[PDB]
């Protein structure tokens, strides 16, 4: 939908940008910050915004960049501590094949993060083959 | 050969020691660090520093990796105090702690050419304090903008050579110091 002509969003379509708690760019003022009308929890990029940038990346001829943004879009729903756990689980020798598949099922069932789930399962398969699972060092 | 392998190292059971973990070529194929300091002298100072603090020193040789971070990690998994000191043949040293990420540490000495026998002593001394849950002042930072220009190429060569002795899956061997 979104193309290069729609970029930058902040300049071309600022209203298209809303936060996780449905706040607008104009809602973020010093006044609202001081009175706590807006807080850190309100300042979070949305999956809608990332999917818009993905479309723009694709229009600019950058398919992998767009795919990265699609994954990021799903990950917005995953809590900070869980993001860190999953990242660490993917590092060398940290996990068993089943733990990785469990992370994948969780990503899908609890967050609907289907792309990321497939990403993790792919890693699981290759980690067995290239011996990068717990106990292979 | 001032170092003898006495068998697979077992895990410490008390908070009374600090493990010194050295690379697979330390004291063997290589016997001096990047600037000529003998491995025998280096291990001597690290040990004296630890013992001087009322803590035991146990030395082991690591094989699964030549990277100083992972060498140290192998050491902190077996250390009774959770504290370890990793040392590569070229001299690079790190103080690690069971529980920390492999690439995280308590103190790091990333410019081996600048290390002296006195530094190796304070390091052993500080490792011990950490083992005793004390918060010692970090060993003063040693930095020199020309360290890389003068020694990086040599560092790469010495590490390439030590790395040839890496053995995947081989557990650490405790060492008897002559």
């Amino acid at each position: 939908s979104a193309r290069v002509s729609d970029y930058p969003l902040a300049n071309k379509h600022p209203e298209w940008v809303k936060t996780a708690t449905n706040k607008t760019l104009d809602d973020f003022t010093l006044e609202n910050v001081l009175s706590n009308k807006v807080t850190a929890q309100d300042m979070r990029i949305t999956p809608e915004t990332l999917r818009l940038q993905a479309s723009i990346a694709k229009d600019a001829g950058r398919d992998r960049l767009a795919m990265n943004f699609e994954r990021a879009a799903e990950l917005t729903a995953v809590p900070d501590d869980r993001i860190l756990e999953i990242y660490n689980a993917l590092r060398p020798y940290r996990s068993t094949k089943e733990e990785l598949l469990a992370i994948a099922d969780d990503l899908e069932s609890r967050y609907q993060a289907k792309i990321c789930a497939a990403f993790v399962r792919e890693a699981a398969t290759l980690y067995v083959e290239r011996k990068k699972l717990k106990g292979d060092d | 050969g001032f170092l003898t392998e006495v068998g697979e190292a077992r895990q410490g059971t008390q908070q009374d020691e600090v493990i010194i973990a050295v690379g697979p070529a330390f004291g063997l194929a290589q016997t001096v660090n990047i600037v000529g300091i003998p491995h025998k002298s280096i291990l001597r100072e690290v040990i004296a520093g630890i013992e001087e603090e009322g803590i035991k020193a146990r030395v082991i040789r690591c094989f699964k990796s030549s990277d100083v971070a992972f060498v140290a990690v192998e050491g902190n998994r077996l250390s009774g105090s959770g504290i370890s000191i990793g040392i590569q043949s070229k001299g690079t040293t790190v103080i690690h702690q069971q529980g920390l990420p492999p690439l995280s540490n308590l103190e790091l000495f990333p410019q081996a050419p600048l290390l002296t026998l006195e530094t190796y002593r304070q390091i052993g001394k500080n490792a011990a304090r950490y083992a005793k849950r004390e918060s010692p002042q970090p060993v003063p930072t040693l930095n020199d903008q020309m360290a890389r220009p003068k020694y990086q190429a040599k560092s790469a060569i010495l590490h390439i050579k030590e790395t040839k002795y890496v053995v995947t899956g081989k557990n650490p061997q405790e060492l008897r110091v002559a």
Partner: protein, 551 residues
């Protein structure tokens, strides 16, 4: 008997540099090694079965990642059949549009693009780089650190750096636990220098992401990837863990790029018999495959490796060219020490400086080198005047500009005062008026009073443990008499909500305007076209100190 001519030469600084004869079996060769694989690719039912000589049965994690996501398989066979010399010619031909080239390069295998650029000399590579650079406007990035992790000095040096022209600035710590203070000090000082400057704090991967999640940084760059599986493993990551990390930064609206550099596999012991350039090409494709918009390369911290062997510096320009040619933002190094010679380090810098890259230096030291915590940069604060003179001499925009002492003093002073208010407002260890004055007129940490590190580290750690976020900094500023700076800080935070600066080569200029390869398209087509130093920007660069009026 001794030759006095050779005794003089022996004393030259350049002879203190490390040089070595090529060691092909161990990959200690910059490029064009007889061990490098011949370009090739085989595809069956949409899946690669062979990549540059290697059968899919022998693929490592890198081959798999590149084969599946790093190459446009739809045109891979077509491009592979094209003549590499013709392709290299196309790269430096001013009349072959960048838009005509990218569709071809992104379909090339790692070996193929290496073969292409290896047919070129440095002049041809520079001619090509000015065209392939993603952003039409070149930029610069600086290191802002000091041996004491003094926050007051960091803010001051950061303000001066932003005022001089750096659009990205990076800090790191001498003492790990100081991180939060360094990050906040860098961000505050940078906004005082020029609202819009992006900041990063380079730390252990998990730690850096957490810091970003708390809102104390604008981007991350030292997100490492490596060229061989064993090295990547000692680096404590795989292509998948790093690809996940990339999307994680983007899910928090934070800009990021990977970091690599020729010679890292040699430095880390497993080059698998390949040249530094070929292995770096694998890193460049890992980046492309992960969907990461940019990359910091050009040897970077391992510059002592390629520089030690023949054609190493040419190889460095080559890897930068490959990065840009594959449609990736390139933060082109020139940020690490490799020589004791001023002549030699200048030659190395001009390769990127003359044509211009997204970030000419990915770490010019904005502080004297004795305070550089990345073990020293290729240029430091004391080279500022020389850099500006060369810009003027050659009419080249190197991203920086001459500046008045009076303006720097005021800017550094305001940065120190703003951070003083931040610390008081947040209840952090005090910053005294004495400290504010020292930072204002300081050159380096040698001019700064010693702080109580115990107290700083305690509160710095509390920022992490109690999750004190960026909005706390905004409040302290707004409540402390710095409403203007508070607004600029809020504005930089708001950039994380739009996703605009997540695109290729994005920086923020003027009045919060994003400037990336998307809306600042490089349109080079030869002389008198593309970006040209001229107008007021040229006048700005001509105004160096000491230029007296003849009359």
């Amino acid at each position: 008997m001794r030759s006095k001519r050779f005794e003089a030469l022996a004393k030259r600084p350049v002879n203190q540099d490390g040089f070595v004869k090529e060691w092909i079996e161990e990959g200690f060769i910059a490029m064009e090694s007889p061990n490098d694989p011949k370009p090739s690719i085989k595809i069956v039912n949409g899946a690669v079965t062979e990549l540059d000589g290697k059968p899919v049965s022998d693929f490592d994690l890198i081959d798999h990642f590149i084969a599946r996501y790093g190459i446009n398989l739809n045109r891979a066979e077509e491009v592979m059949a094209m003549d590499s010399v013709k392709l290299a010619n196309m790269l430096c031909d001013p009349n072959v549009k960048r838009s005509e080239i990218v569709p071809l390069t992104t379909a090339m295998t790692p070996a193929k693009i290496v073969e292409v650029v290896s047919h070129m000399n440095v002049v041809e590579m520079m001619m090509a780089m000015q065209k392939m650079r993603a952003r039409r406007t070149p930029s610069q990035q600086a290191h802002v650190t000091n041996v004491k992790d003094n926050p007051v000095q960091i803010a001051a040096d950061a303000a001066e750096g932003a005022w001089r022209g750096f659009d990205e600035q990076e800090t790191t710590v001498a003492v790990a636990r100081y991180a939060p203070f360094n990050a906040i000090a860098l961000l505050v000082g940078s906004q005082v220098g020029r609202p819009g400057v992006l900041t990063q704090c380079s730390l252990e991967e998990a730690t850096e992401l957490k810091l970003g999640m708390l809102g104390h940084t604008c981007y991350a760059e030292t997100i490492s990837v490596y060229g061989t599986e064993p090295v990547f493993t000692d680096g404590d990551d795989t292509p998948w863990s790093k690809g996940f990390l990339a999307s994680s930064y983007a899910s928090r609206g934070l800009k990021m790029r990977f970091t690599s550099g020729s010679g890292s596999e040699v430095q880390m012991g497993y080059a698998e018999g390949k040249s530094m350039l070929y292995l770096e090409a694998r890193c460049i494709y890992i980046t492309k495959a992960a969907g990461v918009q940019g990359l910091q390369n050009g040897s970077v911290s391992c510059i002592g490796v390629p520089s030690a062997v023949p054609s190493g510096i040419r190889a460095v320009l080559a890897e930068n060219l490959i990065c840009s040619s594959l449609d990736l933002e390139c933060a082109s190094s020139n940020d690490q020490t490799f020589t004791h010679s001023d002549m030699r380090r200048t030659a190395r810098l001009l390769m990127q400086f003359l044509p211009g890259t997204d970030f000419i230096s990915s770490g010019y030291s904005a502080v004297p080198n004795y305070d550089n915590m990345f073990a020293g940069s290729n240029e430091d604060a004391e080279d500022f005047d020389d850099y500006n003179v060369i810009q003027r001499d050659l009419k080249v925009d190197g991203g920086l500009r001459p500046v008045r002492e009076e303006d720097v003093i005021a800017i550094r002073n305001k940065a120190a005062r703003a951070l003083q208010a931040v610390f008081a407002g947040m209840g952090l260890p005090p910053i005294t008026d004495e400290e504010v004055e020292a930072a204002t007129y300081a050159h380096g940490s040698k001019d700064m009073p010693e702080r109580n590190i115990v107290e700083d580290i305690k509160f710095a750690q509390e920022i992490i443990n109690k999750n004190r976020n960026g909005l706390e900094v905004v409040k302290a500023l707004a409540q402390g008499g710095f409403t203007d700076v508070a607004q600029d800080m809020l504005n930089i935070q708001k950039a994380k909500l739009t996703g605009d600066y997540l695109h290729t080569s994005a920086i923020i200029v003027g009045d919060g305007q994003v400037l990336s390869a998307v809306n600042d398209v490089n349109d080079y087509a030869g002389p008198a076209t593309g970006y040209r130093l001229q107008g007021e920007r040229w006048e700005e660069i001509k105004n160096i100190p000491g230029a007296l009026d003849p009359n």
